[PDB]
Design an enzyme around this catalytic site. Structure first.
Site, PDB file in Angstrom:
ATOM      1  N   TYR A 252     -26.455 -12.433  36.205  1.00  0.00           N
ATOM      2  CA  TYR A 252     -26.682 -13.687  36.958  1.00  0.00           C
ATOM      3  C   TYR A 252     -27.684 -13.520  38.098  1.00  0.00           C
ATOM      4  O   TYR A 252     -28.755 -14.112  38.045  1.00  0.00           O
ATOM      5  CB  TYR A 252     -25.352 -14.208  37.495  1.00  0.00           C
ATOM      6  CG  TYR A 252     -24.370 -14.635  36.434  1.00  0.00           C
ATOM      7  CD1 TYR A 252     -24.506 -15.841  35.775  1.00  0.00           C
ATOM      8  CD2 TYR A 252     -23.300 -13.829  36.087  1.00  0.00           C
ATOM      9  CE1 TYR A 252     -23.593 -16.247  34.809  1.00  0.00           C
ATOM     10  CE2 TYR A 252     -22.389 -14.213  35.122  1.00  0.00           C
ATOM     11  CZ  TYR A 252     -22.526 -15.441  34.488  1.00  0.00           C
ATOM     12  OH  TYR A 252     -21.622 -15.840  33.545  1.00  0.00           O
TER      13      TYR A 252
ATOM     14  N   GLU B  45     -18.709 -14.000  45.194  1.00  0.00           N
ATOM     15  CA  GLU B  45     -19.435 -13.859  43.900  1.00  0.00           C
ATOM     16  C   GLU B  45     -20.702 -14.715  43.947  1.00  0.00           C
ATOM     17  O   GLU B  45     -21.836 -14.206  43.659  1.00  0.00           O
ATOM     18  CB  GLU B  45     -18.595 -14.333  42.730  1.00  0.00           C
ATOM     19  CG  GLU B  45     -19.172 -13.930  41.394  1.00  0.00           C
ATOM     20  CD  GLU B  45     -18.453 -14.483  40.178  1.00  0.00           C
ATOM     21  OE1 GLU B  45     -17.846 -15.571  40.294  1.00  0.00           O
ATOM     22  OE2 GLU B  45     -18.481 -13.819  39.138  1.00  0.00           O
TER      23      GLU B  45
ATOM     24  N   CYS C 149     -21.233 -15.898  30.694  1.00  0.00           N
ATOM     25  CA  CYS C 149     -20.346 -16.971  30.181  1.00  0.00           C
ATOM     26  C   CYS C 149     -20.934 -18.320  30.597  1.00  0.00           C
ATOM     27  O   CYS C 149     -20.883 -19.298  29.767  1.00  0.00           O
ATOM     28  CB  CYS C 149     -18.911 -16.814  30.670  1.00  0.00           C
ATOM     29  SG  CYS C 149     -17.989 -15.520  29.787  1.00  0.00           S
TER      30      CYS C 149
ATOM     31  N   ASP D  24     -12.075 -19.296  28.973  1.00  0.00           N
ATOM     32  CA  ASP D  24     -10.651 -18.876  29.068  1.00  0.00           C
ATOM     33  C   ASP D  24      -9.949 -19.937  29.898  1.00  0.00           C
ATOM     34  O   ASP D  24     -10.002 -19.852  31.115  1.00  0.00           O
ATOM     35  CB  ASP D  24     -10.499 -17.480  29.670  1.00  0.00           C
ATOM     36  CG  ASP D  24      -9.071 -17.092  30.029  1.00  0.00           C
ATOM     37  OD1 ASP D  24      -8.128 -17.822  29.619  1.00  0.00           O
ATOM     38  OD2 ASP D  24      -8.920 -16.039  30.716  1.00  0.00           O
TER      39      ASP D  24
ATOM     40  N   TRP E 282     -15.534  -8.185  38.811  1.00  0.00           N
ATOM     41  CA  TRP E 282     -16.481  -7.427  37.936  1.00  0.00           C
ATOM     42  C   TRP E 282     -16.132  -5.931  37.822  1.00  0.00           C
ATOM     43  O   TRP E 282     -16.941  -5.168  37.238  1.00  0.00           O
ATOM     44  CB  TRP E 282     -17.905  -7.561  38.467  1.00  0.00           C
ATOM     45  CG  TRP E 282     -18.506  -8.907  38.278  1.00  0.00           C
ATOM     46  CD1 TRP E 282     -18.446  -9.957  39.143  1.00  0.00           C
ATOM     47  CD2 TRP E 282     -19.330  -9.315  37.185  1.00  0.00           C
ATOM     48  NE1 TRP E 282     -19.166 -11.005  38.648  1.00  0.00           N
ATOM     49  CE2 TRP E 282     -19.723 -10.647  37.449  1.00  0.00           C
ATOM     50  CE3 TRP E 282     -19.762  -8.696  36.007  1.00  0.00           C
ATOM     51  CZ2 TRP E 282     -20.517 -11.381  36.568  1.00  0.00           C
ATOM     52  CZ3 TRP E 282     -20.551  -9.420  35.140  1.00  0.00           C
ATOM     53  CH2 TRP E 282     -20.928 -10.741  35.420  1.00  0.00           C
TER      54      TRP E 282
ATOM     55  N   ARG F  72     -20.440 -21.054  27.438  1.00  0.00           N
ATOM     56  CA  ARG F  72     -20.374 -20.673  26.006  1.00  0.00           C
ATOM     57  C   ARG F  72     -18.958 -20.211  25.638  1.00  0.00           C
ATOM     58  O   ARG F  72     -18.599 -20.249  24.427  1.00  0.00           O
ATOM     59  CB  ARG F  72     -21.379 -19.552  25.687  1.00  0.00           C
ATOM     60  CG  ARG F  72     -21.114 -18.236  26.403  1.00  0.00           C
ATOM     61  CD  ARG F  72     -21.911 -17.064  25.841  1.00  0.00           C
ATOM     62  NE  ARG F  72     -21.562 -15.851  26.569  1.00  0.00           N
ATOM     63  CZ  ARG F  72     -20.535 -15.044  26.305  1.00  0.00           C
ATOM     64  NH1 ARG F  72     -19.751 -15.253  25.258  1.00  0.00           N
ATOM     65  NH2 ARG F  72     -20.313 -14.013  27.109  1.00  0.00           N
TER      66      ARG F  72
HETATM   67  O1  LIG Z   1     -16.267 -16.854  34.725  1.00  0.00           O
HETATM   68  C1  LIG Z   1     -15.808 -16.522  33.633  1.00  0.00           C
HETATM   69  C2  LIG Z   1     -16.025 -15.262  32.975  1.00  0.00           C
HETATM   70  C3  LIG Z   1     -15.443 -15.026  31.786  1.00  0.00           C
HETATM   71  N1  LIG Z   1     -14.681 -15.965  31.125  1.00  0.00           N
HETATM   72  C4  LIG Z   1     -13.983 -15.583  29.896  1.00  0.00           C
HETATM   73  C5  LIG Z   1     -14.391 -16.205  28.584  1.00  0.00           C
HETATM   74  C6  LIG Z   1     -13.747 -15.181  27.650  1.00  0.00           C
HETATM   75  O2  LIG Z   1     -12.310 -15.243  27.683  1.00  0.00           O
HETATM   76  C7  LIG Z   1     -14.290 -13.901  28.291  1.00  0.00           C
HETATM   77  C8  LIG Z   1     -15.721 -13.500  27.970  1.00  0.00           C
HETATM   78  O3  LIG Z   1     -15.775 -12.630  26.790  1.00  0.00           O
HETATM   79  P1  LIG Z   1     -16.827 -12.962  25.598  1.00  0.00           P
HETATM   80  O4  LIG Z   1     -16.516 -14.405  25.290  1.00  0.00           O
HETATM   81  O5  LIG Z   1     -18.204 -12.722  26.113  1.00  0.00           O
HETATM   82  O6  LIG Z   1     -16.470 -11.977  24.513  1.00  0.00           O
HETATM   83  O7  LIG Z   1     -14.204 -14.192  29.705  1.00  0.00           O
HETATM   84  C9  LIG Z   1     -14.394 -17.192  31.712  1.00  0.00           C
HETATM   85  O8  LIG Z   1     -13.692 -18.049  31.184  1.00  0.00           O
HETATM   86  N2  LIG Z   1     -15.006 -17.404  32.934  1.00  0.00           N
END
Ligand SMILES: O=c1ccn([C@H]2C[C@H](O)[C@@H](COP(=O)(O)O)O2)c(=O)[nH]1
Ligand SMILES: NC(=O)C1=CN([C@@H]2O[C@H](COP(=O)(O)OP(=O)(O)OC[C@H]3O[C@@H](n4cnc5c(N)ncnc54)[C@H](OP(=O)(O)O)[C@@H]3O)[C@@H](O)[C@H]2O)C=CC1
Ligand SMILES: NC(=O)C1=CN([C@@H]2O[C@H](COP(=O)(O)OP(=O)(O)OC[C@H]3O[C@@H](n4cnc5c(N)ncnc54)[C@H](OP(=O)(O)O)[C@@H]3O)[C@@H](O)[C@H]2O)C=CC1
Ligand SMILES: CC1(C)N=C(N)N=C(N)N1OCCCOc1ccc(F)cc1Cl
Ligand SMILES: CC1(C)N=C(N)N=C(N)N1OCCCOc1ccc(F)cc1Cl
Ligand SMILES: O=c1ccn([C@H]2C[C@H](O)[C@@H](COP(=O)(O)O)O2)c(=O)[nH]1
Lengths: 547, 541
Positions: free
Chosen positions: B366, B318, B426, B449, B340, B446
């Site tokens: 990105y 990635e 993110c 998870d 992705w 921002r």
């Molecule tokens: O590298 C990554 C990519 C995604 N997310 C998570 C954050 C959220 O659970 C979701 C993104 O969805 P939105 O917050 O944009 O709706 O994916 C991560 O934690 N890390």
């Protein structure tokens, strides 16, 4: 020591003091000191109707006991009286007037041994489970006979005056009510050489006032697990240098305080951290900073407005800046016509030429905050252009998201337009705001890439705090937390002496911010829609000390 | 008469165990290497040596009286016998193994279990013994703080067999060495870990320090001031989620949680106890909080979570895909990197109003923003060479030419391009900081998870910090992770509860191929993880 009566008998005073009228109290040119909070009483009652958080504080302090610590207290008291050796309770002492000011449903004060001082009244004048004494000396005889934990003098003024002048008080538990009421009795002026502040609580809102709890102290003028701590610190010689040293004795007051829980200590502790552990770096033409990288502050806007109290700040400029941003303006002359000079230096022929903006008009700051907030991605022309429906109206977008998609994880306002950085007078310090909505409450994270702790940060805290309130209100929410992330956090060497002065000042309860509640759109605010109530602050500091 | 002898005389073991030669399954027994040919398995680990010195030297004279009183009562005695130091007990092999210049061990009552030689050849202050039984006798007659069993194997074996050990001060050397002799298998039921140190690099290995404790079943003036300031705290009302903390017995039974992995686990614990219940765009529940910071010291360790198994080939691919500036989903799909895939489907793009976007064409995400910020995006196949701002090129040039700059940011949040992206980034931005030839990195996320995303995200940006550091001839210092919207998916909670009750192992290290000196010249083979000791994989769902 020749043990003192106050220490043997653990005699403490507890009070609450508001501010007082004082012929309008000078008016705006006003000097503040610890004696600012001195109002005790009006017309034999409290000067305020109900401050429930103070009431809950007063009850918890005066009822709380620790049984296991009685053994050591009985021994000390018994030793002192040259003597051999029910639920444990505190004793509380009230003047007759104080006692008569208390509504009947409250007295005698629950889970406490009630003592009243009176000449005019005798035990036959009271139905209640109370001791009458007619003499301070009879109190000390009484503590000698009673099983109790601590003894609290509850006021009023006459009782405070005599216990203090007798040097019978070991600590004063002192509530600062940060509002003004009519008063006819006042707390004694505390001698800064007899008593020193040792603790400052968090700031709270209760019944439409901010307040905090300070503690004055009288001056002299499985064990097994504890060793495992020592072991785990076998290598702590790297932060035991404190590289820069800057001398302990320059922070006697700062370092004297035991509990530093006022939110202003989030700012002051970062300055201390940078002074003692900061990296020496070049900056520009020799100028010089101490720098660290990565801090977070959190301010509860539901409880206070975090306007720094350890020096004087004015907000007219930074509010005029925020309104200027919301209008999408880039024109430096608009602010200069309001005698706001924040952007003056960044708009001069010489500043623009040294940025390579040779074809830019003086005070045309280019596509800075305002333009990115209303028009991100539009081609900047000049500061007079009409950019209507050009670029992305971010501000509008995030107000829409907060209102209709509050659980969104995509509510960001971003000023760091990579394409436009070189056309800006300078790139933005304030990179992005992200918002969070829960239970009708709006929180804001602001990420700041570069942070002048001495001059910039105090104003940046105020700016984004006001902005959170404005967005909260036009989206029908209550402000919750303002969260400030510091990337490059630095103290200019020029600022160091001025900051040393400020670090040894004790914060005051914060003020409150009032917004015109009729303003329902972000675009419709004007300077007179903003009011700072009850700003109590130390004297102004020029951080330069030279120019 | 219900008192262990070990509690009376305060007999502790102190050891250092490396790993031993032969998917590998790891446990506490993983770390059991003690010695090789009458000598330590490793050349010299100066931080284990320093720790050893301090723990065995240290005494508290203010806490001895309470010990002398429980001790003299026990012996049916009353007095000292008829400068406080500790006692240190060695097996004879262990005694000889030490270079002469350390003997007798500074500031310590040296003892030696030897069935063979006697007082004869040795001074006074250097006691000798024939049986284990004859040590208790000698402690019964001595002024000493604590008694440390210093090894070797046979000695640990027989002291642990005779239930004589109160705690084990256990250094984990996270490298493999050749070994003759091993620490016994510590019964999970006999002993339990109550403390885990910070992770450290000494002499080209990571190591930490843990404490086993024998299982119990098998100015106060300002102390009250503290309670007054808690007068307004919520008691069981603020522990407001019924996740049932008694499911976290292990997590809550540890006193000292200084392992950097606790920065992650504590945030999960925080969002579980104090998190706000919310819906989201997937419709599953979350517990969410707003604003956290983690800091990892890259100079001491690679922060790859150890409380479950993590795989890194995909996240490295990635990263290389980003650096190339690619937006083509298929490149990753053809390498079996499916991070992705869901974001590139006909259905996903359509629901994003990208009706005119080819499958797995992720738009100006990105890679496109890092190498072409501001260029007009066409399709994933167009030639964008020398179009838009090459931020990656720019941050590297600023690091090398203007290292004290406060403008070294890499920003993926292109407000103009968000709607064109398969989804918004993110990972909003990276800021860099250079002091004394050392590179630190802040990454602002921002949306976080915890549980599935964040563990990978720590690894990604830790790796990136190393790659930028290498090509700029700097050493990596800190990776600093700022979480905005920090959430645990309700479907993750059972799995995270299992994870919190696992004790981290010492972190691995990342080795980059050192010949790479342009950010664009890395390939998957240039990345190795060393000494990754991890708990069992967990399906978070
Ligand atoms: O590298 C990554 C990519 C995604 N997310 C998570 C954050 C959220 O659970 C979701 C993104 O969805 P939105 O917050 O944009 O709706 O994916 C991560 O934690 N890390
Ligand atoms: N903000 C706060 O923290 C507090 C406010 N208050 C307020 O303060 C005011 C009351 O204060 P104040 O007017 O000073 O009166 P006090 O409550 O101090 O009481 C004075 C009376 O107590 C008796 N007294 C005091 N000392 C002695 C002594 N040494 N020996 C015998 N009797 C003694 C006398 O009673 P007698 O005349 O019967 O002999 C005296 O007139 C009220 O407004 C009350 O609401 C009170 C406490 C705390
Ligand atoms: N990793 C670590 O923390 C440590 C590792 N080591 C290493 O381990 C090895 C040492 O372990 P090991 O070889 O098992 O030897 P030990 O150090 O356990 O010593 C064994 C000898 O000690 C004596 N002894 C043992 N039990 C008794 C007893 N009950 N009563 C009287 N004497 C007794 C005997 O010596 P005799 O025959 O003379 O009576 C026995 O042969 C070395 O390689 C050393 O470097 C050592 C210390 C710490
Ligand atoms: C002002 C107060 C209560 N708070 C602080 N910090 N310290 C004090 N000494 N206080 O006064 C204690 C006596 C007065 O008590 C009451 C008055 C009015 C009431 F309606 C109920 C009560 Cl109990
Ligand atoms: C391995 C070690 C030192 N660390 C821990 N944590 N626990 C122990 N029991 N240790 O062994 C103590 C005896 C070994 O002593 C030496 C050996 C070689 C030397 F060159 C110097 C010394 Cl002192
Ligand atoms: O609102 C502002 C604007 C500027 N600065 C400070 C941070 C730095 O000291 C300087 C900006 O310089 P650069 O980081 O852009 O070089 O101004 C602030 O703290 N707050």
């Amino acid at each position: 020591m020749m043990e003192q009566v106050c220490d043997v008998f653990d005699i403490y005073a507890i009070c609450a003091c508001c501010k007082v009228e004082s012929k309008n109290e000078g008016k705006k040119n006003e000097v503040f000191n610890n004696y600012t909070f001195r109002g005790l009483g009006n017309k034999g009652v409290l000067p305020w109707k109900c401050i429930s958080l103070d009431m809950k504080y007063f009850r918890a302090v005066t009822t709380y006991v620790n049984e296991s610590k009685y053994e050591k207290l009985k021994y000390k008291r018994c030793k002192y009286l040259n003597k051999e050796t029910k639920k444990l309770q505190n004793v509380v002492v009230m003047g007759r007037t104080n006692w008569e000011s208390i509504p009947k449903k409250f007295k005698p004060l629950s889970n406490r041994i009630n003592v009243i001082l009176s000449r005019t009244l005798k035990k036959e004048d009271f139905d209640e489970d109370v001791y009458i004494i007619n003499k301070v000396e009879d109190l000390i005889v009484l503590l000698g006979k009673l099983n109790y934990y601590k003894c609290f003098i509850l006021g009023g003024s006459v009782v405070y005056q005599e216990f203090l002048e007798k040097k019978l008080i070991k600590k004063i538990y002192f509530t600062r009510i940060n509002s003004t009421y009519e008063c006819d009795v006042f707390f004694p002026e505390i001698n800064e050489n007899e008593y020193q502040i040792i603790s400052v609580s968090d700031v709270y809102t209760s019944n439409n006032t901010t307040l905090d709890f300070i503690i004055y102290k009288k001056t002299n003028n499985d064990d097994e697990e504890e060793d495992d701590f020592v072991y785990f610190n076998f290598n702590k010689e790297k932060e035991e240098k404190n590289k820069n040293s800057i001398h302990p004795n320059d922070f006697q007051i700062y370092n004297s305080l035991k509990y530093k829980y006022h939110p202003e200590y989030q700012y002051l502790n970062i300055i201390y951290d940078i002074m003692m552990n900061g990296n020496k770096q070049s900056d520009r033409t020799g100028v010089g900073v101490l720098s660290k990288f990565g801090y977070i502050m959190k301010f509860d806007l539901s409880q206070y407005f975090p306007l720094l109290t350890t020096k004087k700040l004015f907000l007219r400029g930074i509010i005029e800046e925020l309104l200027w941003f919301i209008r999408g303006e880039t024109n430096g002359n608009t602010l200069l016509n309001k005698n706001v000079r924040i952007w003056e230096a960044n708009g001069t022929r010489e500043f623009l030429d040294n940025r390579k903006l040779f074809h830019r008009e003086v005070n045309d700051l280019g596509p800075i905050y305002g333009f990115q907030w209303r028009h991100f991605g539009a081609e900047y022309t000049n500061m007079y252009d009409n950019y209507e429906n050009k670029g992305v109206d971010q501000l509008k977008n995030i107000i829409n998201l907060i209102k209709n998609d509050p659980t969104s994880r995509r509510i960001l306002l971003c000023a760091w337009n990579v394409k436009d950085l070189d056309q800006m007078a300078l790139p933005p310090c304030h990179i992005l705001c992200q918002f969070y909505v829960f239970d009708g409450k709006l929180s804001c994270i602001m990420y700041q890439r570069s942070c002048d702790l001495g001059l910039g940060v105090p104003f940046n805290i105020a700016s984004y705090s006001i902005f959170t309130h404005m967005i909260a209100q036009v989206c029908n929410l209550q402000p919750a937390q303002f969260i400030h992330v510091l990337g490059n956090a630095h103290v200019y060497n020029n600022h160091i002496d001025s900051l040393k002065i400020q670090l040894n000042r004790i914060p005051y309860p914060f003020p409150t911010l009032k917004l015109n509640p009729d303003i329902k759109n972000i675009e419709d605010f004007t300077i007179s829609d903003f009011t700072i109530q009850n700003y109590v602050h130390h004297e102004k500091i020029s951080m330069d000390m030279a120019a």
